[PDB]
């Protein structure tokens, strides 16, 4: 199963990792993305959770707009998870770099419950321009499923580690 992680609460852990080396080594049955409303994976976990995919999760994300339409901010969607898990939560966490409402990364973590346990990163984090301390109190305070949380700089997963309450 998922190795090496520090439990931070009853439901929450954490872990620093790349989350596409986690996935492949796990193959959970849900890994969550940091999508956006288009399913556009160019940077970030996005982009990374792509490659690894060989482009086979931007191939299937645009099937899934063409016929859907966007998502919403604060929005997710269930599709493959290629060759990383059973399924991909493709989760929408507000950019605060496109001035997008930081309020919307609580209802981002309520598409967790809908899961008994995922592999995740930190949403609105990185490339989103949220701060990473603010999300994983929100993670903490929202999510009641098992999240294992992959923070990739392992400077952030010290200050993170170190500054919990």
């Known amino acids: 199963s998922f190795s090496g992680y520090?439990?931070?609460?009853?439901?929450v852990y954490i872990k620093n990792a790349d989350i596409v080396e986690e996935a492949k080594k796990v193959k959970p049955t849900v890994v969550v993305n940091a999508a956006?409303?288009?399913?556009?994976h160019g940077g970030g976990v996005a982009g990374a959770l792509n490659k690894a995919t060989n482009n086979a999760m931007q191939?299937?994300?645009?099937?899934?707009?063409?016929?859907?339409?966007?998502?919403?901010?604060?929005?997710?969607?269930?599709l493959s998870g290629h060759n990383l898990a059973k399924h991909c939560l493709h989760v929408v966490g507000p950019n605060v770099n496109k001035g997008e409402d930081i309020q919307l990364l609580k209802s981002a973590?309520?598409?967790?419950?809908?899961?008994?346990?995922?592999?995740?990163?930190?949403?609105?984090?990185?490339?989103?321009?949220?701060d990473p301390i603010h999300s994983l109190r929100v993670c903490v305070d929202t999510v009641r499923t098992n999240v294992y949380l992959a923070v990739f700089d392992k400077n952030l997963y010290d200050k993170l580690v170190s500054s919990f309450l």
């Open 6 to 11: 520090l439990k931070l609460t009853d439901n």
């Open 36 to 40: 956006n409303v288009y399913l556009k």
């Open 59 to 78: 191939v299937e994300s645009d099937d899934y707009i063409a016929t859907n339409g966007p998502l919403k901010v604060g929005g997710s969607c269930v």
């Open 109 to 130: 973590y309520e598409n967790f419950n809908q899961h008994e346990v995922l592999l995740a990163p930190l949403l609105s984090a990185g490339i989103f321009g949220a």
